[PDB]
Design a protein around this nucleic acid. Structure first.
Lengths: 62, 84, 111, 134, 247, 64
RNA sequence: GCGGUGGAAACUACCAAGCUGGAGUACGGUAGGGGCAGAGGGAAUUUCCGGUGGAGCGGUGAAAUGCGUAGAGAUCGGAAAGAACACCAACGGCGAAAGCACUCUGCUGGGCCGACACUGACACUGAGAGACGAAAGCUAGGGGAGCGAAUGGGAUUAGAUACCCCAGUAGUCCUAGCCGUAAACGAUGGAUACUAGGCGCUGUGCGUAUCGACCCGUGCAGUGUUGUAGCUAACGCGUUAAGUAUCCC
């Protein structure tokens, strides 16, 4: 299941970001946010590598 | 849990205290450790060995320590005097 | 009987020691601030049972409201096996620091 | 399952018999099957057996020995890769080497299949030299 | 809402300096009219709530002030503390719980608390620690006094039945608001001060001669002859209420 | 030994105080002969009971 | 060498379609000084305030400067202050490294293990780039007990800007930044696959044994110590290679 990985990582970045911006100095979870961004980004380049229209739907969903 | 023997020896210069210890619910073999002629601590060495065991109950550790203490005590008095 | 409700929120247990003098408004008023916790928490709040007063090791420094007087050797050992949301535990800490008959209140989180 | 499936088999051969163990377990892909097919028939090894463990067909391969010696195999096997991934090598039917005069062979990928120097020198075809053993 | 009919209007004219007309508080004059704000220091309405609707800039102060209403029909201004959420409710009284913004007498409260507006005796409006960040703490209380560490590094046992507005008073960032326009000193009604070396011997005791004159006297003095370093200007027997100067 | 099934809490002052000395200080794993997990868990529990003044921080020295 | 043209399809690439052991996710557990924030703690030290008592205390290789009849130090009580957190502490656990240990709470990272529960190669490395980055340093504001560059005095010394001693400022701590270096060391870039063992530790999993804690073997992951092969100039390293190979900087 791929779109649950992208969507799940998106909610991960939402909850972790609204953690981090009202907190502002945790330099440990910064790596977690950046590993999630990079991991999701290699997924988006993967599904963009496979398809057009379907990845256009992944952009249009979020 | 078997039960226990300190053996002391007094010769004028030198104490030895020798702690022979015994088994808990876990089958173990102690020696008798003999603590030695130089001024290096006998009670601390003995008691610490017992505490390191936990295999020794408090009553057991204490009774042997009391006997050990008594001999070190007699030894100190004889060394300060000449008893022999 | 306790694993019924912890779908949804958390579980704690607060240890709080008391004055040794008073016998009245001690089971009463601290259960009334436990009802203040009931306005806050509202979950399976049971087993708020009391432990007998015994001599502790060493304690000073009551800090009454402008008293700063009493040394102690004894104290009533309350412990609340309560159950709440993880939100609003710091107001339980302020409630169990500021009040007079509660000194040295350490909460915990049993698993 | 690393980068190479041929340094897979080959490094399992070198690491197999440099510790004198006469038994190899490797994956059985198409080109591994072809190499052990053109390698059992050339006297280097003894037997290759396919089987399965979790329905994954593998090759266990029995190496050669001799009798009770200081080391029970005298001639050290000396396997070597040539066409590394990222540096492909290619030869005509001129360059195709007689290894040590012929005591080694150079297994290589023709358009026919994969041959040796005997079976690609008579053909006159050339191709990508996988590796040569000696 | 300006022109509140609480700005109270008539004053003594600007930043005045005239006793009989003689310059007696020096370097004053200039600036705007600076109409004052009659604010409510001594809260004479206890145990009735009141919201906060406006943080107005008082030009008389270093801090801001705020307009507070009531459940009854009144309007006052008080010093808002740090943390004045707009719409938040303040209430004076004797048993009102401690919140950043409300007032209570100095007895019914714990020790070790941030309070700005305290009273030195009963009946007065408001004396101590009311600047733009002036915060006074409480050391423990006594029978009819209360040792209070006010923002000078100075402690003072005080009458315990004095009103006090608990909170740290806001607008702290005037520690760093630079006056770098270099004529903005004159906008506050503060004329430039001349220096004692460059005056004449009829004016200042350090009226010199040729060149940048060294200070000449055994001590650097005021323009009226008293030594201006270390000489404590305090009557020897006034109150004896302060514990230690701690300065 | 002495695990006794129920987990070690500050409320269990039976197996606790078999682990401190009469001088009131925590004994190591090789003396008490437990696992690492038992040792750390009684460590945190003993220091909790140290907060509640159930246990002394120092016991006054004695002879005779 | 380049070009034209006719053939081959194993390998790279390409086109299409499946596959799962690579990689992830979902789930259930699990361990942790991972990080940050908030509360709370008690020894000890210093200073102050009291009661006692009266001549030294402190220090050293030996002395001295210092402090002390204005009552020192010592002892008991009372406060306050900051900083660090004894035993536990282990050849231990975690982090990517730097680092991380008084306890508790909150938010949150990461790891490990199982079932096929899902997708189907999504993988590795990474120029330039970006982040973090011990200590000392600097800007701004707090705070300042101990320790303590500079400094000052005493001593040793031919001399002493030094080792010793007595005072002692910046600094040490915290907030917000800058700085971006260290023997930042495992003196060992990362990743995958394969190649004896013995003795260990940590985390989980299965079976035995009891039916419950053990206890034995093990499946893995991580950490350590001797060590075969092989490598090495040697010392040594040796499944966590400095071995055999492949890739990337």
């Amino acid at each position: 299941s791929v779109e649950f990985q992208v969507f799940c990582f998106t909610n991960k970045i939402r909850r972790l970001t609204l953690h981090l911006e009202l907190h502002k100095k945790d330099y440990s979870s910064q790596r977690g946010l950046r590993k999630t961004l990079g991991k999701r980004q290699r997924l988006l380049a993967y599904l963009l590598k496979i398809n057009g229209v379907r990845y256009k739907e992944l952009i249009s969903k979020l | 849990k078997p039960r226990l023997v300190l053996k002391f020896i007094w010769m004028e210069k030198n104490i030895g205290l020798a702690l022979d210890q015994t088994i808990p619910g876990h089958g173990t073999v102690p020696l008798s450790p003999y603590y030695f002629w130089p001024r290096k601590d006998a009670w601390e060495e003995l008691k610490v060995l017992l505490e390191n065991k936990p295999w020794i109950s408090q009553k057991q550790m204490i009774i042997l320590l009391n006997q050990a203490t008594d001999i070190i005590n007699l030894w100190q008095q004889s060394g300060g005097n000449l008893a022999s | 009987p306790e694993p019924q409700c912890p779908p949804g929120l958390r579980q704690y247990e607060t240890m709080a020691v008391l004055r040794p003098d008073m016998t009245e408004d001690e089971r009463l008023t601290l259960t009334q601030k436990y009802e203040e916790l009931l306005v806050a928490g509202g979950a399976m709040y049971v087993e708020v049972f009391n432990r007998g007063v015994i001599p502790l090791a060493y304690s000073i420094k009551r800090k009454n409201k402008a008293g700063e007087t009493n040394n102690y050797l004894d104290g009533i050992y309350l412990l609340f096996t309560y159950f709440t949301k993880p939100e609003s535990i710091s107001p339980l800490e302020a409630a169990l620091v500021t009040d007079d008959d509660v000194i040295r209140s350490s909460s915990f989180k049993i698993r | 399952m690393g980068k190479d499936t041929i340094a897979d088999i080959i490094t399992c051969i070198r690491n197999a018999d440099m510790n004198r163990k006469g038994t190899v377990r490797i994956v059985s892909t198409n080109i591994t099957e072809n190499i052990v097919k053109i390698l059992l028939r050339e006297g280097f090894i003894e037997n290759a057996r396919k089987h399965q463990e979790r329905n994954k067909y593998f090759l266990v391969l029995t190496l050669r020995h001799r009798r009770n010696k200081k080391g029970p195999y005298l001639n050290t096997f000396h396997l070597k890769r040539v066409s590394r991934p990222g540096l492909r090598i290619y030869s005509n039917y001129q360059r195709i080497p007689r290894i040590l005069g012929g005591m080694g062979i150079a297994i290589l990928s023709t358009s026919r299949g994969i041959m040796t120097d005997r079976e690609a020198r008579l053909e006159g075809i050339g191709g990508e030299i996988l590796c040569y053993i000696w | 809402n300006p022109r509140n009919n609480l700005i109270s209007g008539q004053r003594r004219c600007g930043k005045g300096r005239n006793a009989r007309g003689i310059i007696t508080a020096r370097h004053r004059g200039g600036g705007h009219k600076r109409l004052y704000r009659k604010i409510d220091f001594r809260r004479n309405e206890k145990d009735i709530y009141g919201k906060i609707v406006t943080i107005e800039y008082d030009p008389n102060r270093n801090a801001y002030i705020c307009l507070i209403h009531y459940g009854d029909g009144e309007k006052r201004y008080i010093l808002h503390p740090r943390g004045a959420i707009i719409g938040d409710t303040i209430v004076s009284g004797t048993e009102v719980p401690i919140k950043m913004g409300n007032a209570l007498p100095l007895t019914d409260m714990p020790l070790g608390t941030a309070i700005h507006n305290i009273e030195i005796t009963l009946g007065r409006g408001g004396q101590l620690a009311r600047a733009a960040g002036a915060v006074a703490k409480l050391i423990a209380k006594e029978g009819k006094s209360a040792t209070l560490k006010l923002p000078s590094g100075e402690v003072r046992l005080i009458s315990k039945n004095c009103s006090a507005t608990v909170g740290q008073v806001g607008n702290v960032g005037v520690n760093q608001k630079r006056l770098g326009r270099a004529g903005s000193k004159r906008w506050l009604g503060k004329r430039p001060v001349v220096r004692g070396v460059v005056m004449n011997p009829v004016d200042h005791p350090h009226g010199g001669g040729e060149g940048r004159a060294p200070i000449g006297r055994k001590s650097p003095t005021t323009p009226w002859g008293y030594p201006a370093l270390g000489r404590r200007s305090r009557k020897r027997n006034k109150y004896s209420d302060n514990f230690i100067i701690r300065r | 030994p002495i695990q006794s099934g129920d987990r070690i809490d500050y409320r269990n002052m039976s197996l606790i105080s078999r682990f401190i000395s009469e001088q009131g200080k925590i004994l190591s794993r090789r003396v008490n002969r437990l696992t690492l997990k038992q040792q750390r868990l009684i460590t945190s529990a003993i220091k909790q009971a140290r907060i509640l003044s159930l246990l002394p921080f120092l016991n006054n020295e004695k002879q005779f």
